[PDB]
C-alpha cells in the first residue's frame, strides 16, 4: 500500500513484501535484523512493519534531536500499542498532554531524595536472598538465577510499591505472588503481536471486546486490591502512598492502579533479567568478579551493610553494571511516532513515520566499540567514561521520555549485588550455556536460562 | 462502554442502549430528533452515536467559542468519516495542519475578485436552462425541478471547474455527465453508515481494502481526466486553472483531484437542492414570486442580463434565498471534534467528544423565530436583518471552517433565479406535494420530488 | 437483517431490536427469559440472538423428534461456538462425521463395566473429603460447599483421568491443581460472549489470531503433560489409558488432549456445583436429610463402605439427586442447529435456525409440576417416577447426543454423598442465603456461594 | 497456520509464505502459475491461497471421479465466494440441496427443444450486427471486436431473457443498457479479491454490511424491473417466462432475479469474449477463415439464413470454435470443495481442501497436444475428435455441474459467426497485437483489445 515511501524519499532499505512489509526478516529477532541493516545500509534506513513505515537513525545529533530537542514538539509518543483497555492510562503507554500530566504527577516519586528513603526497606530483602541462596550453596546443586533473582526482585517491588512483605521464594503461593508473577514481557515476535503488525486494523476490533494484552484477571485483582489498601491506610513510604498523597489535573484512582501495574512489571522481569545477565558475565569472567569483591569489602569492611552513599561510592560496580547494559540493553530499540511533517539535521521526515533508534545495534557497533562483543568493564573507567557518546550508549533512553525508574533500578540492582558478592562466589556449571545465546524471539533474554554454581564465602 | 460520560458530567440526555447508543432515535431523521432533544432538555444535552458521545449545544456565545474562538486550538476537525481512500486529502475532510494548508492553498480561488470573473460564463448556462424549460412550458406537462436545476447546476460546475461545456439535459449521455452524476450525497441514515456508527472499528478494516464511499470508478475517471487537462492546458479561468497555477507546501496533483471532486458535488446536489426548495416556496407563496419578479425587472428592465453588481443590488432576492435556507439548511448540523480537555463558557468538555450545533433545530426554534414554520422573507428585511443572531442562523457554518464556497454558491443560485423569473412563472400542479415533507432519512431533501407548473411569461 | 423470519412463518415472539435482536432481554438471565416466553407465548416461539434466529419448542414429541428421531439427519450439532482453536476437536464441540467418530471412539470409556472399575479409586478420595470437613466440624466455623466439594471433585477427576493423586484442598499449590482450577464455565451473559452474539462475524477474526476461549496457557500445560504421561505409561485404569488404548479412523494425540480437557471441566464445576445444590436443599429441608441418612445406614450398616451395587440399591438417594437436578439443571437449555429445510410434527423449520429446548423452564412448568418451586423428592418415587415425561425432565439431554458422562456423574456424586451423610449433618448458618437466588448471569450458580454449618455425627 | 498440510500428506508444492501462502506467485496470473506447477511437480501438487489449501489434479480418471463420480457425495460446491448478498441464491453460487433444487428448476430452460425456439429471435440481432459493421467497413477505420460483439451479445441476452429489444450499439444510452453493461467479470488478481484471499475472515464482516461484489445499484434496477415485467406479462418465449412458468420447492421471486443476473453476465462478457478470440484467430490464420467461408456458403447458398439444423450441420465451424476454446478456456480452472474425508483413485483428500483442475494448463499440455500453442482446428476433425480425452479438454466443465448454458452459448456464438462470415472478411491492422498477449491479471482476456480490419464481401 504505502510501500513506496522510502523509495521516494531516497532512503535505502530491504524491499518489502505485500501485506507483510519486512516482517519475515524478524526470524532472527529485532537485534540481529537491526545489525544487518546497520551494516548493509549505513547511517539511516527504512523498512515496514506491515504497512507501518519505520525509519531507523544512527546519528547522535539526529538522535538527540528526536529524543530531546523536538521531543515535545514532534516526537512525543511511542508506537501505538494495543489492545490495552484501561491501561491506556499507564504513563509508559500514554500520549501527548495526558502523558505530560502523568510524568509530572509521578516524577517526584523517583527523586534522589525519596530514593534514599527506600534503602533500608530494600536492604531487608537482600538478606532474604542470601538465606535462600546458601540453602543451595550448602546443597551442591546448580542454581537458576532468574528464579532466585526474581524472587528477590518481586520481594522489593511488592514492598516498595504497597508495603506487602512476602518471602516469594518460600511463600510463593500466597495470593499476592500468584497474580503478580503472571506478568509476561510481551514477545513482540510471538504469534499474537506479529498478527497485530500485519492487522493493526484489528486492535480497535479487540478494544471493543474488552480484550487486553494485560490479562483481564490480574488487573481486576489489583484494581480492587488498591482500593482496599487505599481505604486501609486512609485512614490509619511506598509508591502507592506517594501516588495517593499526590491526588490530595490531579491523579485519579484507576489511573493510580495502572501506574502500579507498569511499575510492578517494570522492576520485575527487568531488574531480575539484568541481574541475571550481570551474574552470567561475572561467572564467565572470574577476575572481574574478584576485583569487584575487593571493592565491596574495602568500602564495606567486615561485610558492612551497604548504604545509599556507600553505593554511589562504588565505581567498579558501576562499570560492571554499565558494561552489562551495553551488551544486553533490555529495551533493544527506542521509538517515537513523528507527529508532524518535519526536517531534522537535514532530512525530511513525513508525518506518521515511526522513528527508531537501534540501541542494541549501536551498543555493538565496532565503529564506536573496540571488540564490541567482549565484556570489558574498563570501557567505563573514569578515564574512558568521558569518551562515550550518551547518544550511542542509551540503555535508559534519553530526553523527557527516558526511563523514569533509572536511578531506582540501578540502586535496587546494586544493593542486591553488594550483599550477594559479600557472601558467595559464582562458578560456571557444566550446564551453563557458554557463550550465552540470545533468544531469537522478541525479548532480550537468554535462549536457555542461566544456571551457575554458588559457593559460600 | 463509555455510556456513563454525560451521566457523570451532569448533562441530560436520552438513555442509550448498549452498542446502539441512541441511534434508534434516528427513525425520524436527525432534524426531528434534534428538535425533540431541544425541547425535552433545553440549552445543552448529550447522546451517543454508538459508543461516540455527542454534546449538542445551543448557546450563541458557546457556539461562537467553538466555531470561531477556539477553532484552531480545540475544535479544528469534523467527526472522523471513513472509508475515504485518497479522499482523505479533500479539504472538507482533512485535519489539523493539512487542512490549514489546504484552506490557504484554496482560499484565493473563492474571492470576490475571482468570483466576478466567473459571472459571464455562469451567465451563459442560464440561457440553456430557459430553452429546456420553455420546451416544457410549451408542452403543458408538469416539471420536476431537481432534473432541470441539476442539469443547470451541473452545467455550471463542469464549466467553472474544468472548462468542459455540455448541455447535460440534452447531451446527458456524453462521457463526462455519466460519471459526474454518479455522486450521491450520503444518506447517513442509510444501511451502510448506521453500520459504521455502530462498528466504527470497521473503517480501518475497509480502508485496508481500498474500499471507498466515493466509488472507486468515478474517482479514477477524473484522476486521469485531470492529468489530461493538466497536460492539455500546460501548455497552450476555472477552479482547476486556479489550482494548477497554485502549485507553481505547494499543492500536489492527487490533492488537486480530490478538491475537484469535493467542489463538483458541493455545487451539484447542493445548489440544485437549494434551487428546488426556493422554487417550491415561490410556487406555494405566489405573492412573494410576484414581488421578486418586479424587483428583477426594475433593476434589469427589458429582461436585462444580470451582472455581478446588479445581483448584489437585489435585496428581496437575498431575503428569499436566506429565508429558504432558514427553513432548509441542507447541512442540518455543524460539528467539531474536541481535541483537548477544555472548558468553554463555564462547561467542562472532555477530549474526544463530538460537539454538535443543530442548525435545523435552531432555524426552527420558536424562542428565536416567530411562526418559525412559516415562509416569511421579511424576517430578512434590512429593518429586521439586524435582529438575527449569526450564531443561531448558520446555513454556511461559521468561523475559520465555514463554507468556502458560500459567496459563489449564493451568486450561482441567484444568477439562475434572476434569469428564470424573467421568463416564467411557477404554479402548483395537482401532483405537487403541499405541504412538502422532508425525507425521514439522512438528507435534507423532499420525501417526493418537487413537481410544478411552468408558464411562459 | 433476517429479523422477519418468525413473523413470516407465523411463530410468535418478542420483537427484536436492530443488531441486538432480543439480547437485552437476557438481563435477568436465560432461565428467567425462557420462563416469561413460555407463559407469554405458549408451546413454540421465536427470538434472535443478534441476527441468529432461535426457535424454542416445548412439545415432548417434537422434542423427541429433534433430540432422537431426526438427530443424525437434521439436528446433529450444537450452536457454533468460537473461538476455540484446537478445541474444535473436543467431542462436545465437534460436528457431523467428526463427532460421530469421536462419540464412538469415546463411548466404551463410559460403560457400566468400566464404571464399576473406577469405584474403589473414587471411594478413596471420599475419605479425604471427610477429614478436611471434620477439621472444620471441630472448628465451629461455617463452610463454603463449593471449595470443599470442588476440592473433592477435582481429586476424583485428576485421578480417574490421569492417575495423578493430590490432596487439592491441602496440597492446592502443586503444579497440577493450579492449571486445572483455571477452567471457568463460560458466562454466556458476560461482556465477551454477548459481543460474540452481536458480532459472530468476529469469531473467524479471532480464530486467525490463535485466540482461544480456553486459555492458551492451560492447554499447553496439558498438551505436553499428556505426551509425558503418554510416554511414561508407554511403556511401563483411567480415561487417558482408555483413550490411549483406543488409538491402538483411530484417535490422534491432540484430539486425545482435547477430550481430556472437556472431561476435566465437565466433572469439575458441574459435579461440584450439583453437589452444592444438593447440600443446600438438604440443609433447608432437614427431614429429607434424616430420611436419607437412615437409608444410607440400612444399606451400609456400621458406616459400611459404599459399593457400586449398594449405590444403585439406594432409591431415596436417587430421588434426591433427580429432584435437585429438576430445580437446578445446570445446562439450562438444550440446542441443535437445523441443518436442512425440514418439517417435524407439523411445523416448517428452515435451515440455519437454532432449535432450543428450555430445560430450566420445563422443569419449573406448573402444567407438568405440582408446586414446581418446592423441593419435594417424592415426585421421583417409583410410584410416581412413571408419570414423568422423559422429554420434559431432561437434565442430561437426550438421544444420540445426551450427556456421555451421565452414569459416571451420578455415581461420582452419590459416592460422595453416601460417605458424607454417614459422618456429618448440615445446618443453615446465619450467613446462608435462604432462599437461594440464582445468579442473574449466564450460569446456573447461586448468586452468593453456599455456606452451611457442619456437625460431626 | 495450516501450512503443513501437503508437507505431511507427501504432496509436492511451492513453499508458502506466512499469511500469504503462495499468492505472490500470481504475479503472472493463474494460467502461467498453473503451467509452471504442472511442469515443476507433475501429476498432482498443492499450494495455499492464503491459509486455503488447494490441491491441483491432472489425472483424467481422478478428474472424472471429482467432477462426475463423487460430485453429489463429496465435491458438490465451488470455492466459497463472498460477499454476495442476495446473490447467495444464484445457481452458479449456491450449495448442496439448494443448488440441486435450482439446477432442477432451471434445467428445462436449456434443452435442445427450447433452444430451437430461440433461433429466430437470435437470428434477428445478427442482422443488426452486420449493419453496424458495414458502417465501419465503408468507413476504412479499424474495429475493436469487443465493442461490436458485446453490442451483439448484449442484444441477444436482453432479448432471450426479457423480451427487451434495443440496438445497444446505436441506442447504447437507453436506461436498460446502462445498468446491464455495469457487470464486470471479477479480476480475482485485482486488489480487492487478493485481500479476500488473505483475509477471508472479512467476508462475514462485509456480509453484515450489505456490501456486495455485485453493485447494490444494478441489482436493485433489475429486482424491481423483473417484478414489473412479472406483473406486465401476468397477465397479458424467453428465460424469464420459462422461470415464471416454473414457479407455477418451487422458485421464488428474488431467486428468479438472481438467476437472471447470472444469465445476463454469463452470456455477455463470455460470449462476447469468446467471439473476439475466434475473430482474432481467424484474422491471423486467413486460410482457416477462407475454408470456413466456403462451408457457410455450401450449406447456406446465396447467403441463406442459418437455421438450427443448418448450424449443427456445419463441422469445420465446430472445429474452429472448439480449437479456440482450447487456446482460451475462459474459466481457466475448475474447482470443487471437498466436503468429506475421502480417498479417490488412491490418494487421501482431507475435508476442506479445494480441489482444482487447471483447464488452461491442460489445454496447453504438450503431453496431450502437438504444438499446443498453434491454432490448428484439424485437431477436432471427426478423424481426430475421438482421440481427445474429454477430461483433458474441458471448456464447459463436466459432470452434474458443467456449464448449464453450453448448448445455448455454442449456438448463439455460431449464429453470430455464420452471419458475419457471409458478409465480411477480417484482416490484421497495424495496431493488431500479434501475437496476442493474455492479461497478466485474473481473467482470460487479451492484454490489449483486439482491433482488426473489416472488408465488405
Ligand atoms: C535495568 C532496568 C531498566 C532498564 C534498562 C530500563 C530502560 C528503559 C528504557 C530504554 C525506556 C524507554 C526510554 C526512552 O524511550 O527514551 C524505559 C521507559 C520507562 N521505564 Fe524503564 N528501565 C528499567 C527499569 C525500570 C524500572 C525499575 C522502572 C520502575 C518504575 C521503570 C519505569 C519506566 C517507565 C514508566 C517508562 C516509561 C517512561 C515514559 O514513557 O515516560 N523502568 N525504561
Ligand atoms: C447553498 C449551498 C451550500 C450550503 C448551504 C453550504 C453549507 C455549508 C456548511 C454548513 C458547511 C460546514 C460549515 C461549518 O462547518 O462551519 C460547508 C462546508 C464546505 N463547503 Fe459548502 N455549502 C454550500 C455550497 C457549497 C459550494 C458551492 C461549495 C463549492 C466549493 C462548497 C464547499 C465547501 C467546502 C470545501 C466546505 C468545507 C470547508 C472546510 O472544511 O474548510 N459548499 N458548506
Ligand atoms: C451432574 C452433572 C452433569 C450434567 C447435569 C450434565 C448434563 C449434560 C447435558 C444436558 C448435556 C447436553 C446433552 C444434550 O444436548 O442432549 C451434556 C453433554 C455432555 N456431557 Fe455432561 N453433564 C454432567 C456431567 C458430565 C460429566 C461428569 C462428563 C464427563 C465426561 C460430561 C460429559 C459430557 C460431554 C462430552 C457432553 C457432550 C456430549 C456430545 O456432544 O456428544 N458431563 N451434559
Ligand atoms: C463460451 C461461453 C462459456 C463457457 C466457455 C462456459 C464455461 C463454463 C464453465 C467451465 C463452467 C463451470 C463448469 C464446471 O465447473 O464443471 C460454467 C458454469 C456455468 N455456466 Fe457457463 N460457460 C459459457 C457461457 C455460459 C452461458 C451463455 C450461460 C448462460 C446461462 C452460462 C451459465 C452457467 C452457469 C449457470 C454455470 C454454473 C453451473 C452450476 O453451478 O450449476 N455459461 N460455464
Ligand atoms: C452441552 C455442554 C454443557 C456439554 O456444552 C455446552 O453447553 N456448550 C457447547 C460447547 S462449550 C461447553 C464446554 N465447557 C468447558 C469445557 C472445558 C473447559 C471449561 C469449560 C463443555 O462442553 N464442557 C463439558 C460439560 C459441561 C456441562 C455438562 N456436561 C459436560
Inter-chain CB proximity C208 and A192 less than 8 Å: no
Question: Which residues of C are less than 8 Å from A191 in CB distance?
Answer: 209-210
- Cell 533500608 found at: A120
Q: Give A400 Cα–ligand 1 centroid separation in angstroms.
A: 12
C20: contact with B, CB 8 A cutoff: yes
- Report chain A residues whose CB lies below 8 A from the CB of C205: 202, 205
Name the grid cell of A128: 532474604
- Is any Cβ of chain A less than 8 angstroms from the Cβ of D201? no
The cell 416539471 sits on which residue? Answer: B143
- Which residue among B97, B204, B208 places its CB closest to the CB of A340? B97
A38 and A57 Cβ atoms separated by less than 8 Å: no
Q: Cβ distance B6 to B53 under 8 Å?
A: yes
Contacts of C199 in chain B (CB under 8 A): 199
Rounded distance, CA B211 to CA D262, Å?
24
Neighbours of A100 (CB within 10 A): 14
In this structure, what is the dihedral angle of CA atoms C368, C371, C373, C374, given to the nearest 10 degrees? -120
User: Which candidate from A1, A51, A201 shows the least CB-CB separation from B205?
Assistant: A201
The C-alpha atoms of residue A392 and residue A396 are separated, in whole angstroms, by 12
Pairing assessment for the beta strands D52-57 and D44-49 based on DSSP bridges = antiparallel
Sequential DSSP letters for A41-77: H-SEEEEEETTEEEEEE--HHHHHIIIIITTTTT--B
Distance, CA of D234 to CA of C427 (rounded, Å): 80
Cβ of C202 within 8 Å of Cβ of A209? The answer is yes
To test the contact with chain D by mutation, choose from B85, B208, B211, B218 the residue with the greatest count of D C-beta atoms within 10 A, namely B211
Summary count for chain C: helices (H), strands (E): 19, 9
Q: Does ligand 1 come within 6 angstroms of the Cβ of A421?
A: no
Q: Which helix (H) or strand (E) holds D454?
A: strand D451-456
Ligand 1 near A410 CB (within 6 A): no
Taking the C-alpha atoms of residue B429 and residue D132, their distance in angstroms, rounded to an integer, is 45
Tell me how close the Cα of C264 comes to any Cα of chain A, in angstroms. 22
- State how far the Cα of B214 lies from the Cα of C333, in Å rounded to an integer: 47
Strand, coil or helix: D143? strand
Pick A210's closest partner by Cβ from C192, C208, C211.
Answer: C192
DSSP class of B312: H
> Rounded to an integer, what distance in angstroms lies between the CA atom of residue C262 and that of residue C84?
12
Query: Residues A111, B341, A225, A247: is their CA dihedral positive or negative?
Result: positive
* CA C225 to ligand 2 center in whole angstroms: 67
- SS3 breakdown of chain B: % helix, strand, coil, rounded to 5? 55, 10, 40
Residue numbers in A near D198 (CB within 8 A) = 19
Instruction: For chain B, say whether C19 makes contact (Cβ under 8 Å).
Output: yes
CATH of the domain at B10: 1.10.630.10
Sequence-distant (≥ 6) Cβ neighbours of residue C282 within 8 angstroms: C288, C289, C292, C320, C426
Pocket residues for ligand 3 (CB within 6 Å)?
C 67, 91-92, 103, 262-263, 266-267, 270-271, 274, 330-331, 334, 395-398, 401-405, 408-409
Tell which residue, B366, B340, B364, B369, has the closest CA to residue B353: B340
Query: Which of A345, A385, A327, A266 has the alpha carbon at shortest distance from A68?
Result: A345
Cβ atoms of B129 and B420 closer than 8 Å: yes
Residue D263 Cβ inside 6 Å of ligand 4? The answer reads yes
Distance set, CA C240 to CA A404, C35, C263, C264 (Å): 52, 41, 10, 11
Give the Cα separation of D348 and D342 in Å (integer). Answer: 6
Among D19, D25, D50, D194, pick the best mutation site for testing chain A contact (most A Cβ within 10 A): D19
Which set of grid coordinates corresponds to residue C110?
A: 463410559
Q: Which residue of A has its CA nearest to C174?
A: A173
Rounded Cα–Cα distance for residues A197 and A26 (Å): 12
Indicate which of A3, A18, A204 best probes the interface with D, i.e. most D CBs within 10 Å of its own CB.
Answer: A18
Q: Hey, which of A403, A408, A410 would you mutate to test ligand 1's pocket, going by the most ligand atoms within 8 Å of its Cβ?
A: A403
Tell me how the structure was determined. Answer: X-ray
Residues in Cβ contact with A123 at an 8 Å cutoff, skipping those fewer than 6 apart: A305, A306, A415, A419
Task: State the first-to-last Cα distance of chain B, in angstroms, to the nearest integer.
Answer: 63
> How far is Cα A320 from Cα A326, in angstroms, rounded to an integer?
10
Q: Do A205 and B205 touch (CB under 8 A)?
A: yes
| Closest among A252, A183, A192, A187 to A221, alpha carbons compared | A183
Contact A331, A445 (CB under 8 A): no
Whether residue A309 contacts residue A414, with contact meaning beta carbons closer than 8 Å, is answered with no
Q: Which residues line ligand 5 (CB under 6 A)?
A: C 78, 81, 92-93, 183, 185, 214, 261-262, 265-266, 270, 331, 403
Q: How many CB pairs under 8 A join C and D?
A: 22
- C262 alpha carbon – ligand 5 mean position (Å): 7
Cβ(C285)–Cβ(C139) below 8 Å? no
Specify whether the CB–CB gap between D27 and D36 falls below 8 A: no
Give the phi and the psi of residue D354 in degrees, each rounded to 5: -80, 125
Option in D191, D205, D210 nearest B192 (CB): D210
Distance separating alpha carbons of residues D155 and D152, to the nearest angstrom: 5
> Cα angle vertex D376, ends D374, D378, to 5°?
155
B contacts of A200 (beta carbons < 8 Å): 204
CA distance C50 to chain B (A): 12
Residues in CB range of C252: below 8 A, 6 or more apart: none
CA-based nearest residue to B259, from B215, B210, B216, B226 = B226
Beta-carbon-side half-sphere exposure of residue B197 (alpha carbons within 13 Å): 23
**Interface with A, mutate which of B201, B203, B211, B348 (most A CBs under 10 A):** B201
Contact at CB, C202 and A205, closer than 8 angstroms: yes
Q: Does A343 touch chain B (CB under 8 A)?
A: no
**Which residue from A1, A97, A207 is facing B340, i.e. has the nearest CB?**
A97
Atom 32 of ligand 1, nearest CA residue: A405
- Closest-lying ligand 3 atom to the alpha carbon of residue C335: 15
Q: b/e for A385-421, b at 16 or more Cβ within 10 A?
A: eeeeeebbbbbbbbbebbbbbeebbbbbbbbbbbbbb
Q: Is the CB of D275 under 6 A from ligand 4?
A: no
- φ, ψ dihedrals at B19, nearest 5°: 70, -50
Shortest-distance Cα residue to atom 22 of ligand 1: A403
Q: What is the rounded (10 degree) CA torsion for A265, A271, A274, A276?
A: -100
Partner residues linked to B349 by β-bridges:
B342
Contact A176, A166 (CB under 8 A): yes
Q: Select the residue of C173, C199, C202 nearest A173 (Cβ to Cβ).
A: C173
Chains that touch D (3 or more CB pairs under 8 A): A, B, C
Of B172, B192, B208, the CB nearest to D209: B192
Alpha carbon distance A77, A337 (integer Å): 6
DSSP percent split of chain D into helix, strand, coil, nearest 5: 55, 10, 40
Contact A17 D20 (CB under 8 A): yes
Is D403 annotated in some ligand binding site?
yes
Range of the domain at A19: 1-457
Distance of alpha carbon A398 from alpha carbon D178, whole angstroms: 64
Chain D residues with beta carbon closer than 8 angstroms to that of C1:
208
> Ligand 2 within 6 A of B403 CB?
yes
**Closest Cα in chain B to A202:** B205
Atom of ligand 1 nearest to the CA of A359: 10
Domain tally, chain C: 1
Chain D residue with the nearest C-alpha to that of B179? D178
Contact B331 CB / ligand 2 (< 6 Å): yes
For the CA of D110, the closest atom of ligand 4 is: 30
Resolution (A): 2.5
Amino acid at each position: 500500500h504505502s510501500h513506496g515511501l522510502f523509495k521516494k524519499l531516497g532512503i535505502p532499505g530491504p524491499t518489502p513484501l505485500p501485506f507483510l512489509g519486512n516482517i519475515l526478516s524478524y526470524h532472527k529477532g529485532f537485534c540481529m535484523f537491526d545489525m544487518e541493516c546497520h551494516k548493509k545500509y549505513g547511517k539511516v534506513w527504512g523498512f515496514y512493519d506491515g504497512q507501518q513505515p519505520v525509519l531507523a537513525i544512527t546519528d547522535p545529533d539526529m538522535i538527540k534531536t528526536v529524543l530531546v530537542k523536538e521531543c515535545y514538539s514532534v516526537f512525543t509518543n511511542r508506537r501505538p500499542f494495543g489492545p490495552v483497555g484501561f491501561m491506556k492510562s499507564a504513563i509508559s503507554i500514554a500520549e501527548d498532554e495526558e502523558w505530560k500530566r502523568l510524568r509530572s504527577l509521578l516524577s517526584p516519586t523517583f527523586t534522589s531524595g525519596k530514593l534514599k528513603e527506600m534503602v533500608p526497606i530494600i536492604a531487608q530483602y537482600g538478606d532474604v536472598l542470601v538465606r535462600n541462596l546458601r540453602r543451595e550453596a550448602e546443597t551442591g546443586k546448580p542454581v537458576t538465577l532468574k528464579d532466585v533473582f526474581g524472587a528477590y526482585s518481586m520481594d522489593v517491588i511488592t514492598s516498595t510499591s504497597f508495603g506487602v512483605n512476602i518471602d516469594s521464594l518460600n511463600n510463593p503461593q500466597d495470593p499476592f505472588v500468584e497474580n503478580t508473577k503472571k506478568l509476561l514481557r510481551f514477545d513482540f515476535l510471538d504469534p499474537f503481536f506479529l498478527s497485530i503488525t500485519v492487522f493493526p486494523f484489528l486492535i480497535p476490533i479487540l478494544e471493543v471486546l474488552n480484550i487486553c494484552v494485560f490479562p483481564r484477571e490480574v488487573t481486576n485483582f489489583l484494581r480492587k486490591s488498591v482500593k482496599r489498601m487505599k481505604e486501609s491506610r486512609l485512614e490509619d513510604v511506598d509508591f502507592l502512598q506517594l501516588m495517593i498523597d499526590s491526588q490530595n489535573k490531579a491523579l485519579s484512582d484507576l489511573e493510580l492502579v495502572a501506574q502500579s501495574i507498569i511499575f510492578i512489571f517494570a522492576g520485575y522481569e527487568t531488574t531480575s533479567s539484568v541481574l541475571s545477565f550481570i551474574m552470567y558475565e561475572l561467572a564467565t569472567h572470574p577476575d572481574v568478579q574478584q576485583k569487584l569483591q575487593e571493592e565491596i569489602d574495602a568500602v564495606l569492611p567486615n561485610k558492612a551493610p551497604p548504604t545509599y552513599d556507600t553505593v554511589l561510592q562504588m565505581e567498579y560496580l558501576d562499570m560492571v553494571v554499565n558494561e552489562t547494559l551495553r551488551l544486553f540493553p533490555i529495551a533493544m530499540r527506542l521509538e517515537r511516532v513523528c507527529k508532524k511533517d518535519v526536517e531534522i539535521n537535514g532530512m525530511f521526515i513525513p508525518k506518521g513515520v515511526v522513528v527508531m533508534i537501534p540501541s542494541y545495534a549501536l551498543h555493538r557497533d565496532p565503529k564506536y566499540w573496540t571488540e564490541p562483543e567482549k565484556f570489558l568493564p574498563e570501557r567505563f573507567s573514569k578515564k574512558n567514561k568521558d569518551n562515550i557518546d550518551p547518544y550511542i550508549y542509551t540503555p535508559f533512553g534519553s530526553g523527557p521520555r527516558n526511563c523514569i525508574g533509572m536511578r531506582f533500578a540501578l540502586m535496587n540492582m546494586k544493593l542486591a549485588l553488594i550483599r550477594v558478592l559479600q557472601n558467595f562466589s559464582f562458578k560456571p556449571c557444566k550446564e551453563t550455556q557458554i557463550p550465552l545465546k540470545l533468544s531469537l524471539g522478541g525479548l532480550l533474554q537468554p535462549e536457555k536460562p542461566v544456571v551457575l554454581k554458588v559457593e559460600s564465602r
